[PDB]
Design a protein around this ligand. Structure first.
Ligand SMILES: [Cu+2]
Length: 115
């Protein structure tokens, strides 16, 4: 539980490269900051550990939502069933356990609200 995507984005890149290289992640030094972060989370998620995220909900016309930073690629996807089961509304500030995209998916996704 100490890795939170919002906190990682606010961490200086030199500390991110150190963490990543310590995890055995090879040459993060050519990557953009956002990509180093993703790389770390994906690798860390393979151990079964919880990882967290947070943002401001916006519900789109199809019924799913994103948690926005209060830039797209790190917006967190929120399914229709989660919005309706937990009564989440546009503009709520949400925190929860997230998961990396699996194959076919493009965005990190909310796993559990309210953690
Ligand atoms: Cu942790």
């Amino acid at each position: 539980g100490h890795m939170n995507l919002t906190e990682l984005k606010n961490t200086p890149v030199s500390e991110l490269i150190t963490l990543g290289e310590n995890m055995g992640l090879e040459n993060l030094a050519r990557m953009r900051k956002q990509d180093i972060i993703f790389a770390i989370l994906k690798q860390h998620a393979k151990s079964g550990e919880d990882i967290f995220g947070d943002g401001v909900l916006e519900i789109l016309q199809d019924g799913f939502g994103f948690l926005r930073s209060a830039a797209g690629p790190d917006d967190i996807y929120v399914s229709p069933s989660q919005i309706r089961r937990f009564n989440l509304r546009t503009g709520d500030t949400i925190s929860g356990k997230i998961r990396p995209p699996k194959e076919g998916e493009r965005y990190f996704a909310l796993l559990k609200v309210n953690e």
